[PDB]
Ligand SMILES: N#Cc1cnc(-c2nc(CC(=O)N[C@H](C(=O)O)c3ccccc3)cs2)c(O)c1
């Protein structure tokens with residue numbers, strides 16, 4: 234068992250998969266070691282109180298109906314105690330780079346910072362939605378899962394995706410060391426089923442140069458940073 238080089242994984246799997254299904258799962262992305270360390274950093278961020286109620290971020294008014302029940306924080310990847318999260322990001326960035334020019338007609342010129350989230354279970358999740366419905370510039374959603382030994386049958390927390398105009402849907406378990414890619418626009422409405430155990434995940438959104446430039450000012454979610462370069 235050996236690591237598939239990014240270029241091969243990108244061109245032989247990710248590109249075809251995305252252009253055909255618009256949804257792509259990559260298991261055993263970084264291996265147990267790196268995976269658990271990312272879990273420790275995230276869990277540490279949580280214990281040291283670095284998260285903020287996700288509901289407060291999305292909501293419009295204080296009377297707005299609950300959209301999400303998670304806690305989050307934005308990580309750039311260089312902050313103290315976030316080095317491994319930074320490695321994750323460089324890894325994601327490396328794959329995207331090899332894909333670039335082969336994912337639809339998109340020209341990916343950057344990404345958002347990493348949105349580290351925690352779903353404290355207790356029936357908390359995220360209601361059905363589209364990440365980028367108004368052309369805010371984000372073309373690909375990338376999510377990395379960190380939940381060691383997860384049984385959706387009793388803990389739930391399944392990510393169910395409904396590809397627009399297709400006779401099928403996708404049920405993604407928030408499996409440890411699993412990386413997920415899917416178009417961020419209306420093609421992928423999705424919902425996070427009720428969770429009953431603490432659930433951690435890290436999301437990065439990649440920008441398309443064209444759509445971003447044509448983006449409305451009206452639209453961290455909007456901050457674009459360059460892909461990481463190999464140290
Ligand atoms: N499994 C699983 C799983 C599925 N979906 C999601 C998320 N969907 C969104 C929707 C989105 O694109 N943008 C929000 C906005 O428009 O204001 C937003 C962006 C950044 C910070 C606060 C709010 C955010 S997180 C997740 O975290 C995990």
Ligand SMILES: [Fe+2]
Pocket residue numbers: 362363364423
């Ligand atoms: Fe989402």
